[PDB]
RNA sequence: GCGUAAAGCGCACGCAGGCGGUUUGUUAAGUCAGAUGUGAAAUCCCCGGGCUCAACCUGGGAACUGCAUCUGAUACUGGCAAGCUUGAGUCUCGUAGAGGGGGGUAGAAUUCCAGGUGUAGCGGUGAAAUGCGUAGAGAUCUGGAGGAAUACCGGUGGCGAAGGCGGCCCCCUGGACGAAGACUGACGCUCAGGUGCGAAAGCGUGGGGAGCAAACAGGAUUAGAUACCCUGGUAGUCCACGCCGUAAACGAUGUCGACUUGGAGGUUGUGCCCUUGAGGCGUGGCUUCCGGAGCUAACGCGUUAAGUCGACCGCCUGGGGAG
RNA sequence: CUCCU
């Protein structure tokens, strides 16, 4: 009657829009899809990756209750935005309590600064803070035992864009984005940003209080063109990214992501690039002037036809080595620019 | 363009009061004061066709109001065209 | 009453304007189906189901929806009724004259492959004739034991299986569907304004229909 | 019948003409009803009769769709009188806008001229040549002159009846829109003839002439090339005053008014509330797209209709000859 | 060439 009308305003009263009221009971689990029912229209297609805690395995069976989020309705069929963000609000509440407490005490362990402030991780999540926040004074946790246990004492938070730098060790001690866009600027300030949508040319990681970043396709990895960003990173995930460029007009901060496994390649050039170190490597495709061993984490094109034996020109590597086989090959040159290591195979015992 | 003191002067001069602003003698008097004002603007400038179309518009508006007033009350029609000064 | 499943209302803005009798625009720009009018229509549907199933008639259950897939098989094999849940073939009812011998291929092929030449020719031939059986099995499995034209069609989404409705309106089958807010209640005889995309709802509506069928068979 | 088949004036104003919101009273002109006179006879039609039947002749009627007069009816239309406010119009506040006319000014660039540095090419093409350059070109710098158009903003954005209107500032000036009231009281819509405005080209008079560019010259291309391409280059493009009065003047859709499911946007006002946050709910105007019924020969149109209707106007009647 | 939902 008005039973139903009253019933409706009752059910309005006993739900809210965000991920606040822990209501969805997990009513089917299957890898790789969780699904709940928080009194909304449909049932969420939950990833498994919003629900495994800190070492990789699941924590919640049938009947268990986490709130999710809302304010977005119907993309065709379905209901939600993920409950993991839910969690962010809880983290915010604890941070507020510390600010509110006047302080927040947990554990903060910060080994190093991607962009000038040690990284602090609380429970599952890891956050990035400005450089001062990690240490109370000039103590520096580089001399501390690695990934040490303290808490976090807050140094600085940016209040809009979420960057929090927190205080390790020293227990005793106790319009809007675009005018002053010089904070994360200077050349390479690393950031932790969640990606939003990957537009087949891009990835759109954008976190720092109402901005837009791209990390488009050219860097992303250490392969250029065949990459397809959906395969290589994620959807909705907080990553390694830094600015590389901010354009004042046109409002296009052009971030990057290759500032990572670039270092691995450098190590390969070095690590085994000290002089003439020997390597056990597997060939992948012999292209009539070489053999292309490509073991050791993405180091590209290698041994030329000129060595291969103690005969120069007549050899044709398909006749002499193999397809897909691990061999003797030592380094002989790493060229830092133009990304050419040039291994060899004549360094053996025939003469 | 026919400032507010001029319009209040003509409303109070031809109407009943400062509220009877939409009667026929008042509307004819405001259109006539406007036309006789714009004759100085079309004395020079000679080529403002987009404004002269507004002039011809309020000329025909004045003529249809005078045709209504001549049809209803010939007494105030003669008092208005003789008080105001028109008819070729 | 939102009894046990949550069947309150739907999508946002692309409502079919023929369903102006069932709307309440909520604060989140989402429609609320009039739940105090849903229940008389649902009872007017079940009062027909007891009649035509106590006729000893055949109900055909239709819903794919990627989520109401198993609720139709589970909630329809509990009765003595028949279902189509994976893929709706174009012309299973009005071209049933040629769907018939495809059913003969299914029954006449699992007859050969439960005991007969399911190993006697080639491992590749088992990989062909078996794959044929798993292709026809979740395409004709629920309609396999029917052997006739159905007397009713219970559609769970008019907007998703609108060609099954027009299909069984070329011929004289009384269809009835639970419609969404964006669905079209034109071919549907006994319209049920409610939730098409909730697993709770396709448990509730289809479960009460399942009670009216087997409880209705006297 | 008139978006594309033939057919909506290029767009307006506007006299005669046509049409007209709503209430009351009067009139009875239109309108309706009856009656009388008349509407010749023959002919058509009906029911009969006579020629042996029929054709034919003929009795009686009906009809002669009308006109005039008298008597009434007064719902509608019209005439007259008195109103009413919804249609229309006026006033008080603002609001946005490449709306128009006149005047002034700014920066970049192109061209030329004078000077400096400097020397062997420049320019152009699909390739080339004609052309310019050792008389110092092209480039680079400084200065000056003159003309024209206003990058970015620039927005299936804005304004205008249409044509159309883009730097910035001033002066004179038209229209639209909305909120709250007041005022007049049908003053309205359309409009043959008429009058006005009307891109570009062109014509006349007088200026001005950077860049571009018909004609024209030359080089190519080609079988030919009165062309496309290149190098030059005069009318014209610009201004002031007159004329011309046409355009694929196009939404190929006359104007005005009413009604009839939705969605996504743009732009421009405004009201309320927690402006407490770029917030939420409504409300007017103009406009873009997609689609519903309905319509259409289909394509498509689809609340800004090509849907349902009403008022007035223009136009079409096979193709060519022929606008 | 790379600024979307």
The 3 state secondary structure assigned to C141-191 is CCCCCCCCCCCEEEECCCCCCHHHHHHHHHCCCCEEEEECCCCCCCCCCCC
Reported as type and span, the H/E element at residue C196 is none
Pairing relation of β-strands A164-166 and A154-157?
Answer: antiparallel
Strand E contact at CB of residue A244, distance < 7 A: no
- Name the interface residues of A facing C (CB cutoff 8 Å): 1, 3-5, 7-8, 11, 17, 27, 37, 39-43, 70-71, 73-74, 77-78
B1-88: in CATH 1.10.3720.10: no
Supply the Cα-derived Rg of chain A in whole angstroms.
Answer: 27
CA atoms of A122 and A110, how far apart (whole Å): 10
Method: cryo-EM
3-state DSSP assignment of residue A246: coil
CB contact under 8 A, A27 and C36: no
Q: Which of A25, A74, A76, A80 to mutate to test the interface with C (most CBs of C within 10 A)?
A: A74
Tally of CB atoms within 10 A around C200: 19
Q: Which residue of A has its CA nearest to C8?
A: A41
Reported as type and span, the H/E element at residue A239 is strand A238-239
Supply the Cα-derived Rg of chain C in whole angstroms.
Answer: 19
> C99 in the Ramachandran plot: left (φ > 0), alpha (ψ -120 to 50) or beta?
alpha
Taking the C1' atom of every nucleotide in all shown strands and the CA of B24, the nearest one is D184
Angle at C144 between CA C141 and CA C150, to 5 degrees: 115
CB contact under 8 A, A73 and C12: yes
Chain A residues touching residue C200 (CB < 8 angstroms): 37
Query: Cβ distance A282 to A324 under 8 Å?
Result: yes
The data reach a resolution, in angstroms, of 3.0
Residues 6 or more apart from C80 whose CB is under 8 A from it? C213, C214, C217
CA atoms of A64 and A34, how far apart (whole Å): 11
Chain A nearest-CA distance from C77, in A, is 21
């Amino acid at each position: 009657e008005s039973f139903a009308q009253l019933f409706e305003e009752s059910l309005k009263e006993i739900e809210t829009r965000p991920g606040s009221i822990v209501r969805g009971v997990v009513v089917a689990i299957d890898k790789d899809v969780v699904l709940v029912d928080a009194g909304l229209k449909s049932e969420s297609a939950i990833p498994a990756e919003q629900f495994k805690n800190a070492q990789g395995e699941l924590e919640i069976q049938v009947g268990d209750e986490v709130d999710v989020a809302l304010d977005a309705v119907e993309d065709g069929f379905g209901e939600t935005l993920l409950s993991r963000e839910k969690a962010k609000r809880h983290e915010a509440w604890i941070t507020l309590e510390k600010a509110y407490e006047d302080a927040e005490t947990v554990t903060g362990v910060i080994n190093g600064k991607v962009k000038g402030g040690f990284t602090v991780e609380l429970n599952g999540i890891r956050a990035f803070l400005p450089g001062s926040l990690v240490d109370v004074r000039p103590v520096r946790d580089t001399l501390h035992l690695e990934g040490k246990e303290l808490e976090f004492k807050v140094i600085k938070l940016d209040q809009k864009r979420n960057n929090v730098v927190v205080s390790r060790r020293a227990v005793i001690e106790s319009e809007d984005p675009w005018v002053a866009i010089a904070k994360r600027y200077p050349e390479g300030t690393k950031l932790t940003g969640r990606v939003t949508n990957l537009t087949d040319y891009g990835c759109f990681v954008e976190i720092e209080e109402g901005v837009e970043g791209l990390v488009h396709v050219s860097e992303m990895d250490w392969t250029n063109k065949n990459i397809h960003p959906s395969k290589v990173v994620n959807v909705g995930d907080v990553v390694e990214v830094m600015v590389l460029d901010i354009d004042e007009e046109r409002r296009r901060i052009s971030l990057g992501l290759k500032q990572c496994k670039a270092n691995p390649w450098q190590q390969f050039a070095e690590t085994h690039n000290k002089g003439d170190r020997v390597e056990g490597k597997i060939k992948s495709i012999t292209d009539f002037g070489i053999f292309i061993g490509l073991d050791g984490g993405i180091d590209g094109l290698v041994h030329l036809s000129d060595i291969s034996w103690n005969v120069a020109g007549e050899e044709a590597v398909r006749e002499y080595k193999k397809g897909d086989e691990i061999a003797a090959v030592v380094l002989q040159v790493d060229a830092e620019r133009e990304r050419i290591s040039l291994g060899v195979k004549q360094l053996a015992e025939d003469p | 363009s026919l400032s507010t003191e001029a319009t209040a002067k003509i409303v109070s001069e031809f109407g009943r009061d400062a509220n009877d602003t939409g009667s026929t003698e008042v509307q004819v008097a405001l259109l006539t004061a406007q036309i006789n004002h714009l004759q100085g603007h079309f004395a020079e400038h000679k080529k403002d066709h987009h404004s002269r179309r507004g002039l011809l518009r309020m000329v025909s508006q004045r003529r249809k109001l005078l045709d209504y007033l001549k049809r209803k009350d010939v007494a105030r029609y003669t008092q208005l065209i003789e008080r105001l000064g028109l008819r070729r | 009453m939102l009894k046990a499943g949550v069947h309150f209302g739907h999508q946002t803005r692309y409502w079919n304007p023929k369903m102006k009798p069932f709307i309440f625009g909520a604060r989140n720009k989402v429609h609320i189906i009039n739940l105090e009018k849903t229940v008389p229509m649902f009872n007017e549907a079940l009062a027909e189901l007891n009649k035509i199933a106590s006729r000893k008639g055949k109900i055909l259950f239709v819903g794919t929806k990627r989520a109401a897939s198993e609720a139709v098989k589970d909630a329809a094999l509990s009765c003595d009724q028949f279902f189509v849940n994976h893929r709706w073939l174009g012309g299973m009812l009005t071209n049933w004259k040629t769907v018939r011998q495809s059913i003969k291929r299914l029954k006449d092929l699992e007859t050969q492959s439960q005991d007969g030449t399911f190993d006697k020719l080639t491992k590749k031939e088992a990989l062909m004739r078996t794959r044929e059986l798993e292709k026809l099995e979740n395409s004709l499995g629920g309609i396999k034991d029917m052997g006739g034209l159905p007397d009713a069609l219970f559609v769970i989404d008019a907007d998703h299986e609108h060609i099954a409705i027009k299909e069984a309106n070329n011929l004289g089958i009384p269809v009835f569907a639970i419609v969404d807010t964006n669905s079209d209640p034109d071919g549907v005889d006994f319209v049920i304004p409610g939730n098409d995309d909730a697993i709770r709802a396709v448990t509730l509506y289809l479960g009460a229909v399942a009670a009216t069928v087997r409880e209705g068979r006297s």
